[PDB]
Structures are given as structure tokens and as C-alpha cells.
Amino acid sequence: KGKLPPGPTPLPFIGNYLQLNTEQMYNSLMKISERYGPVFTIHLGPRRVVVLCGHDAVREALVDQAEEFSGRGEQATFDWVFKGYGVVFSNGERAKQLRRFSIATLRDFGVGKRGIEERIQEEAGFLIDALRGTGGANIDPTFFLSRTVSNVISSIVFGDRFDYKDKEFLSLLRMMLGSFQFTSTSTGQLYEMFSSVMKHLPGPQQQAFQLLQGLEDFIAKKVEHNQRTLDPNSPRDFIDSFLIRMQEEEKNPNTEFYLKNLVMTTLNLFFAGTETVSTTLRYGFLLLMKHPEVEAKVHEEIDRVIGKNRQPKFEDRAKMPYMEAVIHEIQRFGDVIPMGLARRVKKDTKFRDFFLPKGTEVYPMLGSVLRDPSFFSNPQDFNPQHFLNEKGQFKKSDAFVPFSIGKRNCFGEGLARMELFLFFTTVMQNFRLKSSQSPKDIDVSPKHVGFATIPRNYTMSFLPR
Ligand code: HEM
Ligand SMILES: CCOc1ccc(NC(C)=O)cc1
């Protein structure tokens, strides 16, 4: 045919807005999928987007045609601050340069290595201490968990951890959580469509912008302090590395290594390295209270493989298939980034006898892969067995795509995996969880779904084992 994928008919400017619910974007698009197939075109206001549903559609595009689908599309709320600068929301040579440098700098600062392992273990101990200080009292885990995750990437980017009592530290975390939650609301989803008007209008979007601006002002501040203390022979952190790279590139008029990219790349890492893991942890713990028998089984393995005295280390995962299945199932159930992060085609693309013009936006529906009925027996349930064979051994899935796949996939994946393993395991080793509520009545359905999947507010207690 050589045509754009089929889809419902758009109206000028508003696009397919009347055919969609902004409170439930994922459900809206999946419903439209039922009629037009797993590869269809939608109009998010003025934005023309090809939607890829289910495993085969997403993998075929994003891996089998990796280079063709490896452009970055928009996220309107985040583009408000980044403006195409920094590593995440950027394109071509910019994205290429920053991605290469960031991957390399994270390694030099210990990621994938012993150095960051020791850093995560130290921070996990500070979490345990904090959770003991609650004295088994009913509490909101939110910022306890976010504090601990954040201090890991903070270590890499700013040179050291924040004090848990730093009021500015909690301030930044509130900005992150707030901006994130916004993008998952119906207004955040409306904004994805009508940002041309809405960025200039009053509303909840303006407050979202203010939190993002806060985060920007704080990085800009940390950079200035690093510049006026810089030893160009001994970098303390990501910032100093980037500042040093900037010096070496000072006579290259076409460099990507300028101040704005430094500020934005550093914001990307601080944000990405905090909020997704945090959210996964919070959702994980509530999932576990809803399924206390899963927790029982987690406990059996921890006590057997690790025992009571030593701290979990990363290699313990090799001997711990049940824990590996549990964390996999949390990432699968939680589905933190349900519609991925928008890609776009780099040049004129043929895909499944559709034609996709250059610059075409693409929604890889990661949530529809994580729930694909061809890969999971009961996609709607929480069930570690999804990731286990008959002998109780860990079973990988091609449908396991929470970090996405292809050329612009998550490069924090390894860090994220190390953190989820060590934080989950050290908490579970030290505490049993208690809900303020009866396991029968715990609501594990999402509070919001949009750009992210946000779980419902809850309190709990950590009782010593
Ligand atoms: C459970 C935790 C995490 C999840 C579920 C997650 C998910 C994702 C997803 C879905 C993308 C979009 C990739 C694509 O376009 O296909 C992404 C990109 C990205 N993530 Fe993660 N992430 C997690 C943790 C992290 C961490 C810890 C970092 C810290 C460095 C990080 C940094 C990034 C960056 C810099 C990108 C953009 C890469 C690019 O555009 O080339 N993420 N992540
Ligand atoms: C889709 C990848 O996950 C992310 C990555 C970055 C961000 N936010 C910022 C400000 O970088 C939010 C979510």
C-alpha cells in the first residue's frame, strides 16, 4: 500500500481528542487497537503518532529496524525545560555525543562495578537505619525510599550523598515526584496534545513547570560551584568530567559540550536515576503486602542463601531465582513507563507494508508488551511464576521490556537492576511488612496512568525480623 497505518479520522488541530480519554490514555489507545490492529496512527492534537501494540510490533520496529526507529520523539512537559538539550530528549549528533559520554562517565564513576556496588550497599544500610528509627510505627514509605535511591545517582553526579535531614534535598524530591505524577494525570496527557496553547495558559501545568525550573536552578547552582573549584586533573564527579570535556572542546565551534548540555544531561541523570526506581520500590512493597505468601517465599530464600548477619551483595542474585522472579514481576506488574518514551523515524521508513515518513512520532506501548497474552499466562495478575519454570528456576522473557529495547534504550538499566536487587533484598532481610489494611482490601490498581504508572498513596510499617 505504501500508506501510513490506518486509524480513526482526525479533526483539524484537535486531532483524535474526541476519540480518546486523557485520564486513561493507555486504555483509549488499546481499545482503538482492537479495531485497527496492533500498528495504527493516532492524532494527539496536532501530533501524528504511530502506536505499536504487543510484543512483535514493538520488537520488529525497535530492534529489527533499530536504526530506523531510533530517533527521539516528544514528551511536551519535559521538553518545556530541556528544549531539545541534554541526553534524553535530544536527537542525532547531539544525542549521540551525550549518550556516548554519559555511558563512559557513569562507568569511570563505578557503574557496573564494585565501586557503585559498595555505594549501593552503604546507602542500603542507611535505609535500614532510617526504617529502624521509625520504631515499627505506621509511615509513608515514599520519601524514605526516594531519599536512598537518589543518593546513589547523587553520588555520581554531585560527588557525594545528601544528608537525609537536608530540607533542600526533600524539596528536590518533591519536585521530581510532582512533575512525574503530573505527566500521568489527565491534564498532563491533555498537555501532550495542546501544549501550543497550554504552556501560555494558567493551570496545573504552570506548577509542573515551576518544579522543573526548580530542578534546573539547583543543577545550574551545583555546576557554578564545581567550576570555581575545578581541578582539571582530578574530577570529583560527572559534572567535573563534563566541565573538563568542555575545556578540551573550547576551540571546536560545533561542539555538543557546552554549558546547556551539561546542565540538562545532569538533570536527566539526577531525575531518571531517582524517580523510576523509587516508584518501582514503592509499588514493590505494596505488591508484597497484598501477597504475604510471596513475601514468605522471599524470606525463605534470603535466610537460606544469605542468612541474618551479612549484607546482600550483587552476586547473591545468581543463587536467588525466586527473588529474581519477584523483582521481574514487580517491574512487569508496575509497568512504570507504560507507553515508553516517544521515538521517531530517522528517515523514510517501510514497516509491515506501511509507509512512515521521516520525522514520524512513534509510541512503543511497553505496557502492552509486559501484558502480552502470548508471553504471560495471566497478564493481569501478580504472579512471580511468570518468571519461573516448573523446577523453580528463573525463566527470562522476550516480553520483559521495562527499560525498552533498541538504540535509545535505557542506559541506566544496570544501575537500576543492581539497586532494585540490593534495596529489595536488604529491606526484606531486615523487616517483615505490615499494612494498615487487610491484604484482602489492598488496592494495587494505579492511582494514575499516563506517561508513568503511579501507585496509590499508602502507609505501612517495618517490623523487625
Ligand atoms: C526501574 C527503573 C528504570 C526504568 C523502568 C527506566 C525506563 C526507561 C525507559 C522506558 C526509557 C526510554 C528508552 C527508549 O527510548 O526506548 C529510558 C531511557 C533513559 N533512561 Fe531509564 N529507566 C530506569 C532507570 C534509569 C536509571 C537508574 C537511569 C540512570 C542513569 C536512567 C537513565 C536513562 C536515560 C539517560 C535514558 C535516555 C537514553 C537515550 O535517550 O538515549 N534510567 N529509561
Ligand atoms: C522514560 C525514561 O524515564 C524518564 C527519564 C527522565 C525523566 N525526566 C527527566 C527530567 O529527565 C523522566 C522519566
Count of Cβ atoms closer than 10 Å to residue 31 Cβ: 13
> Which string of DSSP letters, residue by residue, matches 24-43?
GHHHHHHHHHHHH-SEEEEE
What's the one-letter identity of residue 331?
Q
CB 239 within 8 A of CB 414: no
What's the angle, vertex CA 154, arms to CA 312 and CA 411, rounded to 5? Answer: 75
DSSP-derived letter for residue 440 is G
**Measured between alpha carbons, how far apart are the two ends of the chain, in Å?**
64
Whole-angstrom Cα Rg for the chain: 22
Ligand 1 pocket mutation, candidates 283, 403, 407, 420, criterion most atoms within 8 A of CB: 403
Residues having CB closer than 6 A to ligand 2 are: 78, 88, 267-268, 271-272, 276, 337, 341
Break the chain into its structural domains and give their ranges.
Answer: 1-465
CATH code reported for the domain at 1-465? 1.10.630.10
Alpha carbon 456 to chain centroid distance?
A: 18
Ligand nearest, relative to CA of residue 366: 1
CB 15 within 8 A of CB 44: yes
Check whether 410 is labelled as a binding-site residue.
yes
What's the rounded Cα separation, in Å, for the pair 285 and 148? 15
Handedness of CA 183, 189, 190, 196 (dihedral sign): positive
CB 303 within 8 A of CB 433: no
Q: How far is the CA of 311 from the centre of ligand 1 (A)?
A: 27
What's the rounded Cα separation, in Å, for the pair 320 and 300? 11
Output 94-99 pairs: Cβ under 8 A, ≥24 positions apart. Answer: 94/256, 94/261, 95/408, 97/256, 97/257, 98/256, 98/261, 98/265, 99/408, 99/411
3-class DSSP assignment, residue 365: coil
Q: Which residues are 51's β-sheet partners?
A: 40, 363
Check whether 271 is labelled as a binding-site residue.
no
CB 360 within 8 A of CB 297: no
CB 43 within 8 A of CB 15: yes
Burial 306-334 (b: 16+ CB within 10 A, else e): beeeebbbbebbeebbbbbbbbbbbbbbb
The number of the ligand 1 atom at minimal distance from the alpha carbon of 402 is 5
Cell numbers at residue 394, please? 528463573
DSSP-derived letter for residue 21 is -
What's the rounded Cα separation, in Å, for the pair 457 and 447? 8
What's the rounded Cα separation, in Å, for the pair 426 and 91? 39
3-class DSSP assignment, residue 59: helix
Phi then psi dihedrals of residue 307, to 5 deg: 80, -170
Q: Which of 460, 93, 79 is nearest to 284 (CA)?
A: 460
What's the rounded Cα separation, in Å, for the pair 22 and 13? 16
DSSP-derived letter for residue 344 is E
3-class DSSP assignment, residue 51: strand
What's the rounded Cα separation, in Å, for the pair 280 and 415? 14
Q: How far is the CA of 136 from the centre of ligand 2 (A)?
A: 33
CB 26 within 8 A of CB 189: no
Q: Technique behind this structure? A: X-ray
Q: For 391-441, list the strands marked E by DSSP.
A: 431-435
What's the rounded Cα separation, in Å, for the pair 370 and 53? 11
CB 436 within 8 A of CB 459: yes
What's the rounded Cα separation, in Å, for the pair 358 and 204? 34
Phi then psi dihedrals of residue 447, to 5 deg: -65, -50
3-class DSSP assignment, residue 414: helix
Q: How far is CA 64 from CA 10, 247, 338, 407, 421, in A?
A: 30, 39, 21, 11, 30
Name the region of 352 (left: φ>0; alpha: ψ -120 to 50; beta: rest).
Answer: left
β-strand pairing of 361-364 with 47-52: parallel
Ligand 2 pocket mutation, candidates 213, 275, 409, criterion most atoms within 8 A of CB: 275
| Resolution (Å) of this entry | 2.2
CB 127 within 8 A of CB 134: no
Q: Which residues contact 197 (CB under 8 A, 6 or more apart)?
A: none
Cβ(343) to ligand 1 under 6 A? yes
β-strand pairing of 349-351 with 343-344: unpaired
Q: How far is the CA of 197 from the centre of ligand 1 (A)?
A: 29
Q: Which residues contact 449 (CB under 8 A, 6 or more apart)?
A: 24, 25, 26, 27, 184, 338
Within 13 Å and on the Cβ side, how many CA atoms surround 175?
A: 21
What's the rounded Cα separation, in Å, for the pair 31 and 314? 41
